[PDB]
Automatic annotation (TrEMBL):
Role summary: Prevents premature fusion activity of envelope proteins in trans-Golgi by binding to envelope protein E at pH6.0. After virion release in extracellular space, gets dissociated from E dimers. Displays three enzymatic activities: serine protease, NTPase and RNA helicase. NS3 serine protease, in association with NS2B, performs its autocleavage and cleaves the polyprotein at dibasic sites in the cytoplasm: C-prM, NS2A-NS2B, NS2B-NS3, NS3-NS4A, NS4A-2K and NS4B-NS5. NS3 RNA helicase binds RNA and unwinds dsRNA in the 3' to 5' direction. NS3 supports the separation of RNA daughter and template strands during viral replication. The helicase part is involved in the inhibition of phosphorylation of host STAT1, and thereby inhibition of host type-I IFN signaling.
Subunit (UniProt): Interacts with Serine protease/Helicase NS3. Interacts with NS1.
UniProt protein name: Genome polyprotein
Subcellular location: Host cytoplasm, Host perinuclear region; Host endoplasmic reticulum membrane; Host nucleus; Secreted
Annotated source species: West Nile virus
Residues of the full protein shown: 291 to 693 of 3433
Disulfide bridge map: 3-30, 60-116, 74-105, 92-121, 190-288, 305-336
Amino acid sequence: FNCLGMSNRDFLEGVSGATWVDLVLEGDSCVTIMSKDKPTIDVKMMNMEAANLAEVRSYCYLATVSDLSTKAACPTMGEAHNDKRADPAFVCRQGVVDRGWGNGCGLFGKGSIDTCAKFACSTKAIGRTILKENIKYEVAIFVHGPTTVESHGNYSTQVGATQAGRFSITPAAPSYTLKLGEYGEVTVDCEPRSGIDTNAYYVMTVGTKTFLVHREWFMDLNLPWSSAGSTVWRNRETLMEFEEPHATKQSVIALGSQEGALHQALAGAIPVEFSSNTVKLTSGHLKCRVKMEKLQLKGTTYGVCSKAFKFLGTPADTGHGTVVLELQYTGTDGPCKVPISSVASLNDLTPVGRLVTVNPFVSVATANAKVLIELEPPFGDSYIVVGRGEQQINHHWHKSGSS
């Protein structure tokens, strides 16, 4: 539910002098928002699904042929009308065959024949549509307040501390406001109409694997099909073979399975997970506005910590040009601001970076409390300084790159 530890991570800045920021979320992506006079927040896309899918059409890729009969007519006796022709489950084909004394007719000539066969589908693939109605996004936001290495990634710890909360976004309710205790609240306005429209591509299940398939490509499939709530097969002759007409018994066969020919035409399509009638989504995004109007820095009257801090290990690169570190405070002088900054030279009285964990606190009055700090040092050499004068500790850092 956080950005710390992830590899897909982006940083954004409140534009100078407003209270809202536009962004574009992504699947399994995390955005960190840094605003002036306001705490830093993480906004992560947790989930995105569509549920209660509607069936559009089904295609048969393996069919059976049974109950073969051919009605025959002698020359001058008209066209043969096989009586199965009115049965909706049967496929019929009219033909013409030579007839004579040798095979049953008193007169010579061409004879009419009508062969029919029952059509049954053994295995089929089901297409289903996603209506923008169905789509749910689930989002999480975390406030960079006082945290610990052990508590920073712990959800119930942060939910209890009123620093994080998960919530969902639908086209029905594309907006939400999360109460963050004494940090105020953050308001999100979202635009859940993106990448996929009311009828854009479909969800096709072929055997055990489910795919997201192009809509026009789906409806053009050269296979027998039936409609949403109807088991009547149309275009069935693509899976059948009527063999050479014979005066008494013309042969009809079904083809072998066409599943290979589907997966062959699905060798690059996007597979998708589809369980308990809901479908998980990996692609796609979500445009939103984040509103930090009522987002407040909390307890900023407190004084700067007086006593000494101690490092609890070598600070570590996050993989995003920032470093993490965890201090420990020997002092007991209540909640106080941690005097931490990133400088170039040791005796410089100015920073050269920016704190990702804006406004660090020790939050308790007891001794030996721990606090996690994230911060962006400049490229090249720098020092991370904590404390003033005799209690001053520092740590040299080097960051690799040019621009």
